From a paper:
UDP-GlcNAc pyrophosphorylase (E.C.2.7.7.23) is a member of the large family of nucleotide diphosphate sugar pyrophosphorylases. Eukaryotic UDP-GlcNAc pyrophosphorylase catalyzes the synthesis of UDP-GlcNAc from UTP and GlcNAc-1P and also the reverse pyrophosphorolysis of UDP-GlcNAc (UTP + GlcNAc-1P ⇔ UDP-GlcNAc + PPi). AfUAP1 possesses a three-domain fold with the central catalytic domain flanked by two domains of unknown function. AfUAP1 has a large active site cleft, with its wall being formed by the central domain and the C-terminal domains.
Ligand binding at the bottom of the active site induces a number of significant conformational changes compared to the “apo-like” structure. The binding of GlcNAc-1P to AfUAP1 is stabilized by hydrogen bonds with Asn249, Gly316, Tyr330, Glu329, Asn355 and Lys437. Similar interactions were seen in the CaUAP1–GlcNAc-1P complex with equivalent residues (Tyr310, Asn227, Glu309, Gly294, Asn335, and Lys421) except for the absence of the PO43− molecule, which prevents the ordering of R116 (R141 in AfUAP1). We hypothesise that in the absence of this PO43− molecule, the binding of GlcNAc-1P alone would only cause partial closure of the active site. Tyr330 establishes a hydrogen bond with the phosphate group of GlcNAc-1P, and Lys148 is involved in UTP binding, contacting the phosphate groups of UTP and pyrophosphate through direct and indirect hydrogen bonds. In agreement with the structural data, the K148M and Y330F mutants affect the Km values of UTP (10-fold increase) and GlcNAc-1P (6-fold increase), respectively.
Numbering used by the authors: 30 to 50, 60 to 84, 91 to 142, 145 to 383, 401 to 473, 476 to 507
Write the structure that this text describes.
């Protein structure tokens, strides 16, 4: 009846094969088969000039003036105190490459805290450091962007931990768009017959997702003016980092990015770059050996092209307000996964559309800021062990810097975010001994 109305519209569009054979009816009613055809069509039928970003657009935790760094931290913490700052978490992944949602993974710290909890606590701590200047509660909304599979386990998990101390009203879980799977000839793939194989539409899907879910409208009501985005797998992420916030808003950019230093020319890292006079992210493959090896004229101890992308972004709210102008302009790329294709928009494809003066980039310290969880244990790289080690190494550093004496007879100290957000506030440990492995907690 109504069912056959659907089977007609899909068959007319060359996708009647998915009705070949009751939940299907509903899954398929959420898809425009024609729009699938459009994206499959444009995606299946589509010597660049590379230069570093302008020095006017770049800063460095390592190299910039301690005077500017301190001031940016202060201004960024001002913005947090005025409830102007928001975080959008990219939390789509599952832990299958390592089960549960990725943010639930326990990399094996002494506390056994998940990634979600570690991040929540950095938010809690940061609002508390902001309160010391505002005099009142500070609120950083945490918009958690999940995939379809992860939405309910994420909700139940945050519910089971009582939202890690934050107000339920300040943790907003929501969903990014999805697309069916499609074969090599653009025909929708069938996971089983009772359900379409689907997938999330790339980290570029965030922009449209901010509208559909009502997240942008919620930010508007709150007076949000600055937004930090990152991926849940960065176990060291400085959530809502004031130095980043302060930097970007002092230059009043639409978009800013965080990088770490590429130190050896052969590292396979994406680079934030001027590609054809536009800001862009360039894969390592499109980088020539000469340009990869090029040393900086004004600094031969470092490489010319050294801004290694870590998917860690800043946006103005004004920029979000403009999404309706260009959101359609964003191509759905092809992700081959030898049977099929995944149409994925790319978060950075909007970069070249940004005027150069509206774009900025800050290099940060790897060991304090980027330890990605990507691989199973024993891999030796981007795994729970390197993640564990980076956090416990940072913890020992912070302590030792404030005068603590850490003793290792077998390494590192887990410092809870609630005690210290970024190494501050540890003078109480001056003089005392600590037997590593150890765990410092509120």
């Amino acid at each position: 009846e109504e069912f056959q109305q659907l089977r007609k519209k899909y068959t007319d569009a060359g996708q009647g094969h998915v009705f070949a054979f009751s939940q299907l009816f509903h899954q398929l009613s959420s898809f425009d088969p024609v729009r699938i055809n459009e994206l499959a069509d444009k995606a299946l039928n589509p010597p660049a000039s590379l230069e570093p970003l302008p020095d006017i657009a770049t800063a460095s935790i390592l190299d910039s003036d301690p005077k500017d760094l301190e001031q940016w931290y202060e201004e960024g913490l001002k913005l947090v105190a005025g409830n102007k700052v928001a975080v959008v978490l990219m939390a789509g992944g599952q832990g299958t490459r390592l089960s549960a949602p990725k943010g639930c993974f326990d990399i094996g710290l002494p506390s056994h805290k998940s990634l979600f909890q570690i991040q929540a606590e950095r938010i809690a701590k940061l609002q508390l450091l902001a309160q010391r200047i505002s005099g009142k509660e500070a609120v950083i909304p945490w918009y958690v962007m999940t995939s379809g599979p992860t939405r309910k386990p994420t909700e139940e998990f945050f519910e089971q931990h009582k939202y890690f101390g934050l107000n339920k009203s300040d943790v907003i879980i929501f969903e990014q768009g999805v697309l069916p799977c499609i074969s090599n000839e653009g025909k929708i793939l069938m996971e089983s017959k009772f359900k379409v194989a689907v997938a999330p539409d790339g980290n570029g899907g965030i922009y449209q997702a901010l509208l559909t879910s009502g997240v942008r409208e919620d930010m508007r009501k709150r007076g949000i003016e600055h937004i930090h985005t990152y991926c849940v797998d960065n176990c060291l992420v400085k959530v809502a980092d004031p130095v980043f916030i302060g930097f970007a808003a002092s230059k009043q950019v639409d978009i800013a990015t965080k990088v770490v230093r590429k130190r050896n020319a052969t590292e396979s890292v994406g680079l934030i770059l001027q590609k054809n006079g536009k800001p862009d992210v360039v894969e390592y493959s499109e980088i020539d050996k000469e340009t990869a090896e090029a040393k900086d004229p004004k600094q031969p101890d470092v490489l010319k092209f050294r801004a290694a992308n870590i998917v860690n972004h800043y946006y103005s709210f004004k920029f979000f307000e403009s999404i309706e102008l260009w959101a359609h302009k964003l191509p759905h790329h092809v992700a081959r996964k030898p049977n099929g294709i995944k149409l994925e928009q790319f978060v950075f494809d909007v970069f070249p559309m940004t005027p150069l003066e509206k774009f900025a980039c800050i290099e940060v310290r790897r060991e304090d800021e980027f330890s990605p969880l990507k691989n199973a244990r024993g891999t030796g790289e981007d795994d729970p062990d390197t993640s564990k080690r980076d956090i416990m190494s940072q913890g020992q550093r912070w302590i030792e810097k404030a005068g603590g004496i850490v003793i290792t007879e077998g390494v590192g100290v887990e410092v809870s975010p609630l005690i210290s957000y970024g190494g501050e506030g540890l003078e109480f440990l001056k003089g005392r001994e600590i037997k590593a492995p150890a765990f410092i907690e509120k």
